[model samples]
Target: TKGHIYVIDDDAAMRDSLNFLLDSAGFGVTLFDDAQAFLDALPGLSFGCVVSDVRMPGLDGIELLKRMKAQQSPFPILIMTGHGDVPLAVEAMKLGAVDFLEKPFEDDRLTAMIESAIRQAEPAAKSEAVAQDIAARVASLSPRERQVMEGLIAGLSNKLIAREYDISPRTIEVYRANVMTKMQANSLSELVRLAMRAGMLN
Candidate 1:
């Protein structure tokens, strides 16, 4: 199996239909009746896509999306609702739901949306990997270079950084240049943004 699609809904008929549709289309499938059931079953089961209903007992699909985001989980979720629930749908998206569709949605359209969500997940994962690499590079900075980087982000001048560290202005410039090269950043702002994302700026 390339990946499994987990479908969570209270309606058995809907679950069966989705399971059949996705399975026939060459995808592995799993089904659950409610959000709590899904949560109980999710551990040790990695998924490519999660197709869940918007409303259910004990943790709706929107809440499930929030829990996943809070835990930093990477699975993409697609929400389906039978009636109008635009507000919940919007909230799900804001919490990082992959996609949301009201009922009567075409299988083709749903599949297309699911594929898009899966595609987006890859780039997010890859960027996290790259960030880890950048973090490692940041770890190699010398104490003086670290001071220079911190000062640079703080909007300090080379003379001020030198004065603060009791080093010459030329030495501060050298340290700044080294920080830029090691971080592979083309500009100071770009480097600062990297630091921000890596939690180094805070």
Candidate 2:
């Protein structure tokens, strides 16, 4: 067998279709037709992949995932969502589901994604490379850019940093952008993580 996959969906048809699809793909598929069935079985479950619908009758997918996260379950979840429910789907991602899929997804792609998550992998060497890369990027920063980044990571707003530097807000914005671009950080917290990872913080 390829792997085990748990399917949590209130719709019987969806559960059955997934059961057949995953079975055909050489995965052992377990079906749960309601929140009760899955919730009762969750504690006894082991490491595997989970595919759940975003909306269910008894308990919504978000709350269900919340419960699983509280337990620190080893299963990685993939959310299935309707078109109009993307905002909720994004919320599910923030709630810690690995990925979300739109409804009427391709069968082959679905199994492929499930298989990929079931074989989740990472390495410490990759982490060290990122730290060195961040150090190099920080080295490439100009003095002003570094100053702006320091202010940002220190939790100072752009206006506050501008006041301290006697610079205009627009100029501060430019430097902030330069710092963010140079660090390749998508968010302020990510920038802080990169800085901390590179041991740049005192």
Candidate 3:
């Protein structure tokens, strides 16, 4: 998938309009009713940018921006505001929004903003690709091989891992070699890093 555009707004008409506009522009877009819904959906999302309205009943755009920053969210966000809400939008930018859209904006203008947001998110998309590849690589490991990997990520020595599994050190070495080969990691540090990137380690 190229990526997704998460559209957050409380207005049904606005969400529908943007959904049509963005979908017609050949971008994958998902619609949410409010900021909290959008926030809750974050963990299941992979590669994407966010488009959110500035004002809502609860968890407005600025609060969403703050939460994203606090959680170290990888997605770029574009805030949408009414004419008088420009100041809030400005604050959103300082809080890490990629851009802002004032209501009654031209279609072309919003399109341009969306394009810019996607472009700015290219680096995040690259990291997301790495995470996906690591996931696939991890999935290729056998059950026992996975156990060995878990041990390695836990900073366990080969002997310790062997003892835990009641296997000889020589057998542990074989599993370790297989793990390294399947994971395409050149060293222990590299493996640990990849595991972390794959969300397998804290």
Q: Name the candidate that leads on TM-score.
A: 1
lDDT of 3: 0.85
Tens-digit per-residue lDDT, 32-151, candidate 2: 887888888887786578888889777566886788778657677899999998888898889877788898888998988887776662233256457768999999999989888888
As for lDDT, the candidate ahead, 2 or 3, is 3
> Clashing residue pairs in candidate 2, if any?
none
Give stretches of model 2 more than 4 Å off. Answer: 121-202
Estimate the TM-score of every prediction.
0.71, 0.58, 0.65
Ranking by TM-score: 1, 3, 2
Among all candidates shown, the one with the greatest lDDT: 3
lDDT string for model 1 (1-202, tens) is 6457888888898998899888777778888886767777765666468888888667676788877777566778898976678688778888888778998878888778877887878777677668888898789899888889988888888888888878888788788889999988889989888888778766
Ranking of candidates on lDDT, top first: 3, 2, 1
TM-score of 2: 0.58
Instruction: Note each model's CA RMSD in angstroms.
Output: 3.7, 11.4, 4.4
Question: lDDT for every model?
Answer: 0.81, 0.82, 0.85
Worst ten in a row by lDDT for model 2: 120-129
